[PDB]
Amino acid sequence: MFVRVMKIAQNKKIVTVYPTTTIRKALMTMNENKYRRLPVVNAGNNKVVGIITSMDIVDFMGGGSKYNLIREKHERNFLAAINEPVREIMEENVITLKENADIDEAIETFLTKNVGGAPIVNDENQLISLITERDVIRALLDKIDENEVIDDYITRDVIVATPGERLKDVARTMVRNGFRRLPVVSEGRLVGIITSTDFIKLLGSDWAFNHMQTGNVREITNVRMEEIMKRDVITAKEGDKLKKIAEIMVTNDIGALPVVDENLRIKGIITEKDVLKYFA
Ligand SMILES: Nc1ncnc2c1ncn2[C@@H]1O[C@H](COP(=O)(O)OP(=O)(O)OP(=O)(O)O)[C@@H](O)[C@H]1O
Ligand SMILES: Nc1ncnc2c1ncn2[C@@H]1O[C@H](COP(=O)(O)OP(=O)(O)OP(=O)(O)O)[C@@H](O)[C@H]1O
Ligand SMILES: Nc1ncnc2c1ncn2[C@@H]1O[C@H](COP(=O)(O)OP(=O)(O)O)[C@@H](O)[C@H]1O
Ligand SMILES: Nc1ncnc2c1ncn2[C@@H]1O[C@H](COP(=O)(O)O)[C@@H](O)[C@H]1O
């Protein structure tokens, strides 16, 4: 079937920033709009020139190569570094869809190009809209066979964080593996979840505005997972229906559920991208 992606796209206007928008302001925008994904456009002609997600912020904070903007150019000063324009840490060469793109293209793009959301552009590459894996799952939820089970879709080998792990280390794990969410596991048992969004929430805390002005930047990246993880996790289990799990994700704006034992031992993880393999 050939259904236009545009027929689904968030008919809300898309929140954007500009290349000269500071990292600080981009962070606030992410925070204020709850949107953890921001297209970078010209002011301008509205051409998509970049994209910045919470994962890019986690990179910048210590998880990857973008951290050297802080450590090197700005000699460990997180607060001066965030005055840098967003173009310094945004991803360029963006994966986009043409305004005539269809659902199957979007899905293939999500499944093969390891993205969860893509800007929809026209022929001038001006921003029209954006589509996420959630929008597609929401639109096709009642087209999932009610009997289809989650087993085949579960990612068995889970990359994990522990309650004692420092933020600077979990950030490495997230960025290196390209996983925004890590189940938190201790002695084989699920004790929580931590995501890249949590790291962003932390930066906009009173606790963090304190250490920055009178910090002690390092104390932010030294926080252990137990201090900030979500302890009570929406989990899935083998034998659960795929449609049930999918519905739970979409109705809660949650992208990932750790898959657990009745004893809370980790069997796997299932995410929105996995759900979309049903329509592969
Ligand atoms: N459409 C895109 N085109 C190019 N790069 C992108 C795009 N979307 C995200 N990225 C980049 O991918 C890297 C990982 O970010 P993130 O994991 O937040 O995106 P994602 O993989 O699309 O999200 P999700 O885990 O919900 O599927 C970041 O550097 C981000 O800038
Ligand atoms: N399975 C879960 N159970 C309980 N809490 C969760 C679960 N998954 C994520 N969270 C919490 O939800 C909050 C938002 O997480 P996150 O933004 O990474 O979810 P998401 O799938 O990316 O949805 P979105 O991309 O639309 O924001 C975080 O505080 C995270 O700890
Ligand atoms: N923590 C993890 N450990 C192992 N695999 C994971 C983890 N998180 C996600 N995956 C798998 O990686 C693939 C891409 O999923 P994705 O939704 O982009 O991950 P995430 O939401 O954490 O960024 C999926 O098959 C998913 O099950
Ligand atoms: N955008 C960036 N991302 C990562 N590291 C950077 C970035 N900008 C500057 N740096 C680091 O800061 C050092 C000095 O930068 P510069 O003074 O602008 O030439 C560089 O050698 C890099 O190691």
Task: Please indicate, yes or no, whether residues 43 and 117 belong to a single structural domain of this protein.
Answer: yes
Contact in structure between 116 and 133 (CB atoms under 8 Å): yes
Instruction: For residue 221, give the nearest of 3, 26, 57, 53 by alpha carbon.
Output: 57
CA of 155 to the centre of ligand 3 (A): 7
Pocket of ligand 4 (CB under 6 A): 65-66, 68-69, 72-73, 88-89
User: Last residue of a domain, which of 100, 121, 144?
Assistant: 144
Q: Taking the alpha carbons of 70, 76, 77, 78 in that order, is the dihedral positive or negative?
A: positive
CA of 67 to the centre of ligand 4 (A): 9
Domain residues for the domain of 42 are: 1-144
Q: Which residue has the tokens 């034992």?
A: 261
Instruction: For residue 198, give the nearest of 229, 164, 221 by alpha carbon.
Output: 229
Residue whose CA is at the smallest distance from ligand 1 atom 8: 115
Q: Are strands 48-53 and 97-98 parallel, antiparallel or unpaired?
A: unpaired
Experimental approach taken? X-ray
Instruction: For residue 257, give the nearest of 193, 199, 188 by alpha carbon.
Output: 193
Query: Can you tell me the distance from the alpha carbon of 237 to that of 240, in angstroms, rounded to the nearest whole number?
Result: 6
Whole-Å CA distances, 82 to 33, 78, 169, 203:
19, 6, 21, 11
Task: Please indicate, yes or no, whether residues 187 and 126 belong to a single structural domain of this protein.
Answer: no
Instruction: For residue 49, give the nearest of 82, 78, 20, 14 by alpha carbon.
Output: 20
Burial class (CB in 10 A: 0-12, 13-18, 19+), 245: buried
Q: Which ligand is nearest to the CA of 190?
A: 2
Task: Please indicate, yes or no, whether residues 199 and 253 belong to a single structural domain of this protein.
Answer: yes
Q: 241: which strand partners?
A: 149
User: What distance, in Å, lies between the first and last C-alpha atoms of the chain?
Assistant: 12
Task: Please indicate, yes or no, whether residues 64 and 194 belong to a single structural domain of this protein.
Answer: no
Question: Around 263, how many Cα atoms within 13 Å sit in the side-chain half-sphere?
Answer: 6
Query: Can you tell me the distance from the alpha carbon of 215 to that of 41, in angstroms, rounded to the nearest whole number?
Result: 33
Q: Which residue has the tokens 């929401």?
A: 138
Both tokens of residue 91? 């991803």
CA of 271 to the centre of ligand 4 (A): 35
Count of domains in the chain?
A: 2
Ligand 1 neighbour 16 (Cβ under 6 A): no
Q: 4: which strand partners?
A: 102
Task: Please indicate, yes or no, whether residues 10 and 126 belong to a single structural domain of this protein.
Answer: yes
The rounded Cα 239 to chain-centroid distance in angstroms is 27
Q: Give Cβ neighbours of residue 169 (< 8 Å, ≥ 6 apart).
A: none
Task: Please indicate, yes or no, whether residues 167 and 266 belong to a single structural domain of this protein.
Answer: yes
Length of the chain: 280
User: Last residue of a domain, which of 122, 144, 166?
Assistant: 144
Q: Give Cβ neighbours of residue 155 (< 8 Å, ≥ 6 apart).
A: 268, 269, 270, 271, 274
Task: Please indicate, yes or no, whether residues 176 and 84 belong to a single structural domain of this protein.
Answer: no
Q: Which ligand is nearest to the CA of 181?
A: 3
CA of 41 to the centre of ligand 3 (A): 28
Query: Can you tell me the distance from the alpha carbon of 65 to that of 61, in angstroms, rounded to the nearest whole number?
Result: 10
Phi and psi angles of residue 260, each rounded to the nearest 5 degrees, phi first: -125, 145
CA of 218 to the centre of ligand 4 (A): 19
Both tokens of residue 180? 């925004």
Residue whose CA is at the smallest distance from ligand 1 atom 29: 56
Task: Please indicate, yes or no, whether residues 99 and 209 belong to a single structural domain of this protein.
Answer: no
SS (H, E, C) the chain: CCCEHHHCCCCCCCCCECCCCEHHHHHHHHHHHCCCEEEEECCCCCEEEEEEEHHHHHHHHHHCHHHHHHHHHCCCCHHHHCCCEHHHCCECCCCCEECCCEHHHHHHHHHHCCCCEEEEECCCCEEEEEEEHHHHHHHHHHHCCCCCECHHHCECCCCCECCCCEHHHHHHHHHHHCCCEEEEEECCEEEEEEEHHHHHHHHCCHHHHHHHHCCCCHHHHCCEHHHHCECCCCCECCCCEHHHHHHHHHHHCCCEEEEECCCCEEEEEEEHHHHHHHHC
Task: Please indicate, yes or no, whether residues 133 and 226 belong to a single structural domain of this protein.
Answer: no
CA of 211 to the centre of ligand 4 (A): 24
Residue whose CA is at the smallest distance from ligand 1 atom 12: 115
Is-cis flag, bond preceding 215, omega within 30? no
Burial class (CB in 10 A: 0-12, 13-18, 19+), 145: exposed
This PDB structure is determined at a resolution in Å of 2.2
Whole-Å CA distances, 270 to 1, 73, 171, 193, 260:
26, 39, 21, 13, 11
Q: What is the largest CA-CA distance in the chain?
A: 58
CATH number of the domain to which 78 belongs: 3.10.580.10
CA of 53 to the centre of ligand 1 (A): 6
- Cα-based torsion angle of the residue sequence 4, 50, 44, 131 in order, rounded to the nearest 10 degrees: 20
User: Last residue of a domain, which of 144, 169, 196?
Assistant: 144
- Cα-based torsion angle of the residue sequence 8, 253, 225, 33 in order, rounded to the nearest 10 degrees: 70
Task: Please indicate, yes or no, whether residues 115 and 192 belong to a single structural domain of this protein.
Answer: no
Both tokens of residue 11? 């008919």
Using N-to-C axis directions, what is the helix angle for 133-140 and 103-112, rounded to 10°? Answer: 130
Ligand 1 neighbour 235 (Cβ under 6 A): no
Query: Can you tell me the distance from the alpha carbon of 269 to that of 148, in angstroms, rounded to the nearest whole number?
Result: 17
Task: Please indicate, yes or no, whether residues 120 and 172 belong to a single structural domain of this protein.
Answer: no
- Cα-based torsion angle of the residue sequence 148, 149, 155, 157 in order, rounded to the nearest 10 degrees: -150
Contact in structure between 58 and 135 (CB atoms under 8 Å): no
Task: Please indicate, yes or no, whether residues 118 and 183 belong to a single structural domain of this protein.
Answer: no
Both tokens of residue 262? 């009745």
Residue whose CA is at the smallest distance from ligand 2 atom 16: 197
